[PDB]
Design an enzyme around this catalytic site. Sequence first.
Site, PDB file in Angstrom:
ATOM      1  CG  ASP C  69      -2.075  -1.002   1.016  1.00 34.22           C
ATOM      2  OD1 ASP C  69      -2.592  -1.132  -0.127  1.00 34.22           O
ATOM      3  OD2 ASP C  69      -2.429  -1.675   2.008  1.00 34.22           O
ATOM      4  CD  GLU C 196     -10.477   2.546   3.247  1.00 38.19           C
ATOM      5  OE1 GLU C 196     -11.489   1.855   3.021  1.00 38.19           O
ATOM      6  OE2 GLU C 196      -9.335   2.061   3.288  1.00 38.19           O
ATOM      7  NE  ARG C 211     -12.119  -0.871   6.243  1.00 40.94           N
ATOM      8  CZ  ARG C 211     -11.061  -1.304   5.556  1.00 40.94           C
ATOM      9  NH1 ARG C 211     -10.719  -0.744   4.399  1.00 40.94           N
ATOM     10  NH2 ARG C 211     -10.360  -2.327   6.005  1.00 40.94           N
ATOM     11  NE  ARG C 289     -11.608  -5.713   0.230  1.00 39.83           N
ATOM     12  CZ  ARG C 289     -10.432  -5.188   0.585  1.00 39.83           C
ATOM     13  NH1 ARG C 289      -9.321  -5.462  -0.104  1.00 39.83           N
ATOM     14  NH2 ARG C 289     -10.356  -4.417   1.666  1.00 39.83           N
ATOM     15  CE1 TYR C 323     -10.668  -0.824   0.126  1.00 40.46           C
ATOM     16  CE2 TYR C 323      -9.930   1.438  -0.305  1.00 40.46           C
ATOM     17  CZ  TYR C 323      -9.902   0.288   0.472  1.00 40.46           C
ATOM     18  OH  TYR C 323      -9.148   0.267   1.630  1.00 40.46           O
TER      19      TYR C 323
END
EC number: 3.2.1.18
Lengths: 387, 387, 387, 387
Positions: C69, C196, C211, C289, C323
């Site tokens: 990240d 976020e 979140r 996800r 996302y």
Amino acid sequence: DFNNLTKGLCTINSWHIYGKDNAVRIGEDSDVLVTREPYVSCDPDECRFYALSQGTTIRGKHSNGTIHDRSQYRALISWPLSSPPTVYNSRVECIGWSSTSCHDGKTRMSICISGPNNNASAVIWYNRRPVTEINTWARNILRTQESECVCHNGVCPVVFTDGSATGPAETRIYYFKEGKILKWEPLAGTAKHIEECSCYGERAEITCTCRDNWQGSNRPVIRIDPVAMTHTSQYICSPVLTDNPRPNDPTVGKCNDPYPGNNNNGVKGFSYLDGVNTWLGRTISIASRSGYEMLKVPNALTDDKSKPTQGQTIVLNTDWSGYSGSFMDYWAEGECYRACFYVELIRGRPKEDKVWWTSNSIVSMCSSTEFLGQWDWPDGAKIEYFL
Amino acid sequence: DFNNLTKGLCTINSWHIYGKDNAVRIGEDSDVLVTREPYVSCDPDECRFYALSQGTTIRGKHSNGTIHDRSQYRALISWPLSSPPTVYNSRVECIGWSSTSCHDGKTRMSICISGPNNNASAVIWYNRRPVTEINTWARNILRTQESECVCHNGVCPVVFTDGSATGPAETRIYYFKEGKILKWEPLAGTAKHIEECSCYGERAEITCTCRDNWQGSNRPVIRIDPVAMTHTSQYICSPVLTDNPRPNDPTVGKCNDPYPGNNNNGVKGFSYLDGVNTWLGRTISIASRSGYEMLKVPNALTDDKSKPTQGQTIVLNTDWSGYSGSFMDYWAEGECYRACFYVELIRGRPKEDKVWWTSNSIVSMCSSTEFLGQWDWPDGAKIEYFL
Amino acid sequence: DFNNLTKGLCTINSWHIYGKDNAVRIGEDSDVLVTREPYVSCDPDECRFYALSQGTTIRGKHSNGTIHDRSQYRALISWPLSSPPTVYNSRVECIGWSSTSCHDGKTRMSICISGPNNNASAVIWYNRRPVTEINTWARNILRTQESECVCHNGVCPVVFTDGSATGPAETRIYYFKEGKILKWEPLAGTAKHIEECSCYGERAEITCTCRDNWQGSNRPVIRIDPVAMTHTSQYICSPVLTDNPRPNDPTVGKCNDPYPGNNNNGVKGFSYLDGVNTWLGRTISIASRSGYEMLKVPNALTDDKSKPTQGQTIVLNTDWSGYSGSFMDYWAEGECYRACFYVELIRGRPKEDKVWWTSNSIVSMCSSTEFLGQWDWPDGAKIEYFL
Amino acid sequence: DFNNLTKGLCTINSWHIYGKDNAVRIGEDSDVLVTREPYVSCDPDECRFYALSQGTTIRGKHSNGTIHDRSQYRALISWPLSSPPTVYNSRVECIGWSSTSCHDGKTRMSICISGPNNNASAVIWYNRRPVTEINTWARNILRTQESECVCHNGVCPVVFTDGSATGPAETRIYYFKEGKILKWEPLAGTAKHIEECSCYGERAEITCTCRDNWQGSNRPVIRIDPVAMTHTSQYICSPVLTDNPRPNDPTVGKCNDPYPGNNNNGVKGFSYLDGVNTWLGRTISIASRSGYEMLKVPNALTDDKSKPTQGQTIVLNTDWSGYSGSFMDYWAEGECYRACFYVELIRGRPKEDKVWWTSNSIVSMCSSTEFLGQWDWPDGAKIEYFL
Ligand SMILES: [Ca+2]
Ligand SMILES: [Ca+2]
Ligand SMILES: [Ca+2]
Ligand SMILES: [Ca+2]
């Protein structure tokens, strides 16, 4: 508003590097287009590079065979000064295998010829739309300057030849205004054969130094008057012969006749003809398109014994050259027109057999009133990396 | 301010090369997008190329399978005239596998359809924002023109078909103003089946030559009146049949009925229907999408015995063609509208099996009042370099 | 002049495809940048894609390891809508591994965070120059929204969190005007943990759905008032849980407390909270996800028993998502704000082990008052071509 | 209208990441140009990256040998901030192997030198046209700053050196207005040898920190007054020596003489000399161009015992650095000039032998009045992927 040739040529005491794209160097590992017959041309706001694409990249496989001049996949493209003509940045002007282009002050006129050798046609574009069309008159490879035209108060003349390349042909000067034909007239004067004219204009007069393909080692000249729309032709008198191939310089040369010795061949070239302020360009080799140099030969046009008083080597004899032609930034600041030119640096076939393509890059120079030191400006690609 | 169809068609005595991108040639070694169903479309200031991307490059591996029409990874993209549709220069208009697009004078409207075959929807974009949405009415592949629409004082009609391709279907003419629906109306007149309409407009009248997919070898015509917002349909009377596949030309043909002989197939095409000033385009082959030609058939729409008086071959029978469609630069200078068209040059599958993709390039032409010599304008890619 | 949230949300009866870039498909054979955490954001004149570059191309070798990240080679880049984020067309906004960006009507503010985990800092840029700098307060990974902020008459608030991700942390709402800090305030209300935030604004009110990373399967909400510069937080009451991973939907859920069942994990998401006109997005999988869907749950924020009345699948459960976040074109024509959103389609590591990178592409949708049929919009890359 | 240095330097309490292009990382699989001697320079509307191209891509084969400084295929190119200098987005300024460039408020002046070592010449360009030419005076490698100049009410001075690099040479300050020479003057003051000056201006005064190549480990300073067009030179007094290579910091240093210990070598560097608000940059290594750091040494110019009071590491000692230089956005909003700088991160030859090229990337920083945490900003390419 329309541009008007009101200044004269600055004093040229030497030449400075103006532009250089290094295309074949960069094209060894980039998406650069195979091109040839380049030139440079200025708008009111920017100067650009111009060339006939062959519709393929250099490393692309469809580059085998691009020694060929006329095909369906050729186009007039332009791109930002000193960039290489790439697939992603090039702008297409029109479709054709022969061209010329010039801004008139208000907007730009571009002319492309396409066709089979016996049924070709010119489409005149003006402000990016097609406006006027002309067909083969002689029906044997209709063709133009392969470098920029010149305008004056909206009138921009263009020299075309239609006919044989190794004989008598039919050349016309067309006079365009707003992309429309005003008038045209057959070639006049004493020039025997005309091809690929390199033109500039100053003090409301336009001078083209052209190429006699079948006879002359000395170069014909068309002088044009854009207000009266008439012209006349001649040859440069000087014995410093500037075609290629050519014999050796005599001590005396022709003013109204071709100087003999090589037949049915030449290359595009140019000169700036300005009293004692006269500079001729040429390949250094007489046999081959090798090397390039500028020479100061006062009164070359008129003085049939004139010989050089100063010079500058642009490309060394060991390096390949090619076509060359004139341009000036007519919208530049200053009291005089600063003379510029470009040389095409051909790479590949015919002289470089191990590859199957033919491309080129561009070097461009402009004059200085200074006396600047000189460098030589080769293509700089390494043909062995293409193997 | 809104464009208004106030001029009429210029006299078309021949056709000149207008545009040509050489995409598949250039795409052998460049990042060009696999596309199909192209067209051309002019803004007030520039004319562009348009096509449905398949969301992959030609040499990319995801090009295996792009013989397929409808998928999630297709889009309407446009790019500068005569460039190839590359990854780095293409602009996305909207997401879909069927489209049409036209500037109204003030700004541009673009329409994309996406969806499963039984639950598709159109999103009308106007000035680059989505504005209006329409859903399948017949719920069997909602679809549009695949070439540019035409406006007049802000009203731009578009023909959609929803339903069977080998039978009776439901076709509607929608009339948009500012991206909003003014009105729509079911198909009227004698045409039996309508697909992929090619439209132009002059003197406040809009003419679309469409495609009857299930019956007709002769082409249906919708004439539209943008002021009254009504229409009517017919067939071109002439026996010079212009669909593909098709039987051979008879000596007499239908005006209000499909001429029979091939079922459930065709290709997109066009014509300019203007008294004696009438030109039809067609593939030269009757079996295959091969070759392309223009034919001068005076009073084709009305005269059921009309046969050619002049012609021009655009693509030789040995070369692959495909879809074709009309466009004109409505903001060009001049007293009349100069008629233009484009041909899609399909490469790859189905006819060229050794590759696993299907792409195309574009040639575009416009009319001249001159009588210009003719060349042929093939794609020019060499399928063997893709192996 | 400064934008002012004066309209309300249009009626959302379904969703239409708005944008889609097909980057990983196109990036198999093009120079596309590895990115993640995308979003969309509109200027007055155009809407763009946005993401954090990893400073390498997908096929580039330096893509091994981009599961990571935070690094020195990440940046906020934007590019034209529905293009892929390529090396040659992307514009760099600022340098950092966490960001947010919004136009205020006059010009755009962009915020990037860089730093080591314990010594990070935010640089606020405004009109492409750096203006204001903030340092870690809690000194544990200073971080922002990873999607666009929202302004109103020049004031644009931004939520940052600094501190633990699996525990109590320090969240602040900063209020910027002209890139300068007006005020800031610690988090208030009943939300337990904030990360976020996905924000939108209508009728001079700003709503962020965020979140809770350490506790909540239901999503916290910050409501912001841009005129008084105060706020409050809560949780969505509904039992239709919309984080991931998450347990199964109960019949009753929490309004002011985290619904328990998974710890220390989540994903970025959003909702549009508008009376009965309320739509929540979620991954279809509770574990992974995977998949994405929209659900119409009237009065979700307030009604702790609310369950879906209508729905739309965006990405099938078999396809990877990631996302998601809100945006609206505040300068679009019309009487109401049309609600839009985007989903990040992650490819590569962790779930797809055979490759050594992690990238994504974008699908974006906006609302329609129509009832449009639905399609599913997968990434569409074929992981095996990268082997 | 002409820019006027009317503000003073902001307070620099730390540095924030401003720009970073990651070129060599991205250039492992993209068409990025081999370059060196970068810098940054702002127009009124945007700030750009600048460098001398070597006329080849990094992965291109013609990159073997680009350890070489002066050749025909080098050029000054600029590109958008934080992009990598690619073939398709770079703009060529002029042709040469030594340069400087600055906007005067009205438009930009750019200066390139080309030539053989003994016959070089400068061409001054102004508003993208060539205007003025200067020839070698000393005839031994005419050379300039290799970073941006500074203007004030239309006058922009530039320092050139012509002569030996390991001895006495001839340095001139030229004062240009509108690309034309106003005046020039030989070097004055106590500095012994001048190369590659890094300049900034505040309160109508211009300060250049240059490089003494033959003697000094401490750096010479030219202070220039753009209104009176005079200057003077000195050395930084401080014992914190900031050239490379260099001996270790003594406790006392020279104000008007070179501090001895290494001969005939250095690197380009800079400082901001502002009372107690003084910051010097340097490589961390004394032997090698490794690492980079900023140091707060109050009254460094004048106080010959001054030693650091605060510092920031920019590049770790384990990471390669190179040239560095100053710039400021003179058209930024605010009451003071915010100080910025850049470091060149050299990769390849000489220190990294396994490759045959030499390139670099850029990190750029600007000041903050805040006290921001620090990160280190390496090139981040992995030399092994080039093998
Ligand atoms: Ca000859
Ligand atoms: Ca049919
Ligand atoms: Ca959670
Ligand atoms: Ca030194």
